[model samples]
Target chain A: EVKLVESGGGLVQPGGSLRLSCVTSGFTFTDYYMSWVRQPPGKALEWLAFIRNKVNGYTTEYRASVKGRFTISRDSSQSILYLQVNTLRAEDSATYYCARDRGGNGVYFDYWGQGTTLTVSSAKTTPPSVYPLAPSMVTLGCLVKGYFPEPVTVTWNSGSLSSGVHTFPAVLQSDLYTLSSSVTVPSSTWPSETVTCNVAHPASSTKVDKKIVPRDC
Target chain B: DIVMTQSHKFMSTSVGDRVSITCKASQDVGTDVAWYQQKPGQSPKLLIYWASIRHTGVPDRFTGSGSGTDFTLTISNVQSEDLADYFCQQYSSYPLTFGAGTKLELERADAAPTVSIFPPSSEQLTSGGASVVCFLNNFYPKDINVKWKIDGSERQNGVLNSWTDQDSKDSTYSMSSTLTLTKDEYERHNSYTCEATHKTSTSPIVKSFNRNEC
Candidate 1:
């Protein structure tokens, strides 16, 4: 049972071309294959690729690639899958999610369709500070408020930093350098994998890479 | 195709009100970044990065300043229950955007404009389940939009659910939505809205809600 509807309009410039629909009421089109995820503003939710039903061929993963009138279709049995995009720029705004690919197995998502956001503004100003994007497992912390006598580092880019895990602070003056890091990673990594957190300071020249996009209960 | 509109309100219990959210990247995402936050049914929280650092215990009052193709997510001094609603994201490409939220209520010391509804604030004899739930607090659903109306008419099979409220000591966050009614569409008073949008024109504030139960 899947039912996704997104015509909840607003934001479409830079050429403009829109077509969104992901309706499902009980899995047909042979069991399921229709995925699309992207959320922009205060971020989380980025999968963007998958559509298999009208012949078994439709998938995406270049951070959810969509070029030349953006496309993804599925019909015949009509479970619903057709997300069109043409010319539309402004980063194509965001919030265009659709799901029906039980694949991960663990029983997450299962059947999600409460997403259809698009904001490619030239006009639609002001509003964004709720703070809760979605991915899977994220808990990274750092608190170096003041007192930078020297030394300040934390790592977990998750390619495998010998296993990726570190937290040390015996004394840096402790004005407040909280220090925390956690990662479970599974909700496709929000946009399908890529979580880093590197903040070093030998004397501050450059060493800061904090990238996280984890969403999905 | 340039959009970046963020406004926060609460600068005390530590600091808040460094609000800034702008994502003007219709062609340039050379930096590919992301962020998130969802509190209601529990499942969305990734505050600032590649966009401007602030995602660990998240509390320098929260701050993020513009970059590449124009991006910003700031929250400097906004704390009075900090209400809940904020979003701005960009991995630099493909339907991954957000910014449509502004719910930092509770400035009411009598300022008047306080109305709680959505699981809490009970004491009206208790009936429960009215319909329409767009409770996405502490906002971050990128390029956002959340709908469920009744008074204005617009509730299509509504059933998008989410929940998360961390005890509320000072770290407030939320999200909850459910619209299912048939008993004459639940009497039809219908005033439920959880809209968090970001296309930028500054005119999507209709946060109307009513769910009084014991």
Candidate 2:
């Protein structure tokens, strides 16, 4: 049996260096290879590096994207794998994970540690401020502001109407963005339905959802 | 960028049963798929690679097949010790992806083997030489491999490996191995590595010692 755990979340400047570690126990350290994988806040997983200590000694390979900015190393005695990245960029903000390579050509990762989030930004990210306007037959109004990045999505839906269209566009707010969306529903149809507002940013995993029932209207 | 989706999150089985887990890729990935088994709290173990080829030392009962977008890993005869998590991964493209993983649990959970390392006795060390021993206990299925290393280099000389002997009431095995170092090798401050590779482990149970510690 073996266990792997990450050190925790980290915040780094755009031009600074970042180092993350995965500590393992209950198994031989040098028997298998270890790898570092990362997933940007709302994006897919990316392979960063792979390292192993075999009969021939230690070996490591990095992904093309991190080749010049990252280095991977392992401490056989402590059963730890270290992932260091220098010259970070905003896009480098992601949740990094470590896994074990079960021999072969080293593409498969069997054992995985929980991920540790890393944020690389000039300014700390803040959650959006969401406000819902007074309910009316004319429209269901909701506003979202003070969020970083762009390309946020908002959707409005109700049980009575099944689904309703929404328009939430990114508005430049200095270095971040503000957003809002509204959809009209007839008062006659409102009594039987519960309308919901959903706001999400592709750059972050956070989402804001609000619901309004007949009593609120 | 291939996408792998394993729809089944959990599977239950009994001994002597035959089970197969599948991984579907978004597009043609040819024979670039690999399968791995991961026990709880442990790292994964590579079982099949290149779509169908079993890794070296893997049991013959475990088989892999399929090409392009669909692949499968099948175990012909299930054993209680087979309970673990199985995952599939693709290396054919950038941003390589993995299936969410399928857990294979037995009707009853089987205990894993325990291993311990014993350094050379002080008397042996005082004599200017030593013999280090590793004890592997309480393991089932009767299959294991032990290897020795000197100063990080794999070595097969001056080493003695043992066969499994039933030492517990549960029919589990207890095995041992000894690595002898000459006085000259000890005086030079060499580091010795010991590894126990077993079916119950995704990787070996490894430990090392330097001359001063021994």
Candidate 3:
């Protein structure tokens, strides 16, 4: 019956300062320690901070990356946790999550919050380029390349589009991203009308749509 | 890897009786042996570590004494909950290992728990939604499983079972399981069931909440 809720933060600018709050309920707040983790877009999780409240005192631990810039404090009476980050940078832009340390004095996370998504301004936007591939006869292929800020959604639509479609996760290339998405239509109903590939990204001024005509069915 | 052998697989025991469980090690382990007590339906708890040091919250009646290759776990006055399983573990060498274990069986009269279900709280319903609680009282020989089901199938979410609580007045245990439901979720289901199964029970004890009866 444990519950943890994290407050929201904003599109912080470079060198900005911020505070995040996590309110918990249904369990004793001082009994166990609370932890903070963050995951940048399409990246692995990083242990950011851990905090514990003891009799007449408190203990806090921060990862090396945020050792000086990050600090955590809790209000035991309110069962709340607050984290302060100073001099924010683009690397700090990520989904911040809070969790309760495991039962029986364990160190790993067992219960968690849904997380607060944060975005930092001043990250250079790199728009995506969509390319149509003639790699196969019956399958229409489109790949997105050189997109920045990760996670550009790629979707396909055509006249009489088939349900057989495959898309892959984006792979980072330095600071840019790339991925593949293709659709398979039955040879008997091979491309007859124009096929379209739509790439959507936050950096794009408008939705990128690429079209190609294929052999008759 | 050091081998720890507990010869007796099952030993007869009685309430208020003093018993000694023995263990043997293949080599010298110093005072590195640990003793654990495992009751029904839960994880093993450390009774003694460093051979003779009593662990936190363990009863004083349970004691451990041993050195070198031999060890013994002594129970001065056995209680009802102590009639489960006992194991000796050694950490002096690589590949930490424990004994085969000895199950302490109590050939005593069985006592079944009083099982009941309480309807959604009036105050809770005033604040939140319906929250049903299943209560168990005065059960013996601690192994147990209590679960909740909605309609006819088991529910995985919003159901919480409490840890056992042994009453100080008597040695019997008490426990509870709770199910939380939104107003519409409670109204959507025809019945909610709480099923408890104990080792001394021939069949599971079941209590239900039927919305039609309300």
- Candidate 3's error at B161, in angstroms? 51
**Model 3 chain B weakest 10-residue run by lDDT:** B162-171
Number of clashes recorded per candidate: 90, 2, 0
Identify the candidate with maximal TM-score.
2
Specify the highest-lDDT model's number: 3
Q: Best candidate, DockQ-wise?
A: 2
Off by over 4 Å in 3: A1-16, A20-32, A39-46, A53-59, A63-65, A74-81, A88-96, A104-106, A114-123, A134-137, A157-164, A171-175, A190-196, A203-212, A215-217, B1-214
Q: Which whole-number lDDT from 0 to 100 does residue A211 have in model 1? A: 61
Q: lDDT by residue for model 3 over A97-207, one digit each (tens)? A: 787753222234546676776767665667876655432326555656567665566676733464544455565545666565656555564455557878788645647
lDDT of 1 at A15: 80
**Compared with the true structure, what per-residue lDDT tens digits does model 2 show for residues A1-217?**
6678887456566898867888998788887888888766434357788876576467777777778789999875688889888888888877788888664553676567876768776765666655453323444545565676544667765323323233433444355555545455677766476677777765567787776543211
Individual DockQ of the candidates?
A: 0.02, 0.05, 0.01
Write model 1 residue lDDT over B108-129, tens digit each, in one string: 1111111112311111113342
Q: lDDT by residue for model 3 over B1-214, one digit each (tens)?
A: 4678888977866778999999999999888777877554333466787889886677899889988998999998887767677888776754445677887766545668767565664443565566666656657866688878888999878665554434333546566555667877777888888898998778999988677866
Q: Which digits, one per residue and each the tens of the lDDT, describe model 1 over residues A99-192?
A: 5643221111234566666756444222111111122433322222232323345565634542313233322122212222323344454345
